[PDB]
Each structure stands twice: as structure tokens, then as C-alpha cells.
Design brief:
hydrolase inhibitor, toxin; toxin
């Protein structure tokens, strides 16, 4: 979720 380069 933090960041889709990857939660």
C-alpha cells in the first residue's frame, strides 16, 4: 500500500 513498484 505504501508504493505498486511493492502492500
Amino acid at each position: 500500500x505504501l508504493x505498486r513498484x511493492x502492500x
